[PDB]
Design a protein around this ligand. Structure first.
Ligand code: EIC
Ligand code: EIC
Lengths: 131, 131
């Protein structure tokens, strides 16, 4: 888990407006969210992992234990059930709500944190680097 | 093991001339070795790890499997028996020769590869970063 610890700044985004659309995100929300360029701050305190996201759009924060399901209000205000695991060296988050799901894979790849989000066939990719 | 993969350049050295002395390294060898500023290249091919070190002083290379003892000729021409493990998230190498030993711990710490070498109480520290 310590490989993910640090402050990370957005470096690139691809197909994100398409992903948010499949999730159900509204037009005006999709617009300011794409313009954000947020900083992802990941920390660990004992067995508790915290993933914070900061921008002018929104500031969210989840705190969780690996493999323990938790309630989460997403940045676009969906109420979901979330489970995060360590799986092939990546942090894999599955979010479930209203019979649907999406998967948010966070992995290391050289000096980059690579976040890929999938929702029944629509994939977006966001690369972060160390701020 | 993929956290260690890449090219790494020397960034800092501390107490290295003292460590080499306790190991048994000669004067003239100690002098050019301290001036080197080498690049450490770590790669993996299946279950085989390769750690290469390149400089004007010397170019060495070890290839090994985790937890399997192997013969190694060091940069200063000691013939040793070496075992490398993954232990607390660090690559830990123990080198044995002539009833002696030294330990070479390689660990990640933010964006740095931190190599610490110990020989009965004399410790040196070398920090590398991604070239
Ligand atoms: C770090 C938060 C990025 C800003 C998110 C802004 C709006 C998000 C709204 C709906 C989609 C949810 C985001 C899911 C992917 C995590 C963000 C990332 O893949 O990086
Ligand atoms: C990467 C090789 C560095 C150059 C080494 C030059 C001379 C070494 C001679 C005797 C001491 C052996 C080095 C043991 C520590 C590994 C090097 C490092 O801690 O970084």
């Amino acid at each position: 888990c310590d490989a993910f610890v640090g402050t990370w700044k957005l470096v690139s985004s691809e197909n994100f407006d398409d992903y948010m659309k499949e999730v159900g995100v509204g037009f005006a929300t999709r617009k300011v969210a794409g313009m954000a360029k947020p900083n992802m701050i990941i920390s660990v305190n004992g067995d508790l992992v915290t993933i914070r996201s900061e921008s002018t759009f929104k500031n969210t924060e989840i705190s969780f234990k690996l493999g323990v399901e938790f309630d989460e209000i997403t940045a676009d205000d969906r109420k979901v059930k979330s489970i995060i695991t360590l799986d092939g060296g990546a942090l894999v988050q599955v979010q479930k709500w209203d019979g649907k799901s999406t998967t948010i894979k966070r992995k290391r790849d050289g000096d980059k944190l690579v976040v890929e989000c999938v929702m029944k066939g629509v994939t977006s990719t966001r690369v972060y680097e160390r701020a």
